[PDB]
Subunit: 65 residues, 3 copies
Amino acid sequence: MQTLSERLKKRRIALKMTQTELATKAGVKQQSIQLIEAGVTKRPRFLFEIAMALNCDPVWLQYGT
Amino acid sequence: MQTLSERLKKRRIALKMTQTELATKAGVKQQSIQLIEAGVTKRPRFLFEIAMALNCDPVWLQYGT
Amino acid sequence: MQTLSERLKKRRIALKMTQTELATKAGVKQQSIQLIEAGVTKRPRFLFEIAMALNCDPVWLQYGT
């Protein structure tokens, strides 16, 4: 859970959401989530919005603190 | 999408929400949303809460940046 | 509504949520909410996440401003 992709996947799943629901609520492409969760995108463009949908601190999501 | 009313309507709709659902989730009057979306209220009282429900940055919502 | 437990209960209910739904969306234990709402826990560990789920300002939730 020390990687961003790991952190987002774990939190998404803790909130009982699908990648699709995450995507809808954050207003980004579902292909954007997969890439983040699959560890491709290290620096997400809409991290803020993603974090808002996951009810967590963006800083925490990006850096793990 | 350069006006606040435009910005809120577009984001609301991107998130597949109705004015009623926006209102419930933000905890404000549904007549408050219509006024904002109809461009009457330029400076919304609960912008923060509205932005939280739309999973976006309040600053972005108010000014467009 | 001048106490945190009062403030959280009132807002939770304004948003038409159950303690269980609050808990799921915030990603904390449902026993964590009851304790806060029952006034036992004065300084909640996940106040931020709780506030995110209630679409409100954490500061407002904790202090009432």
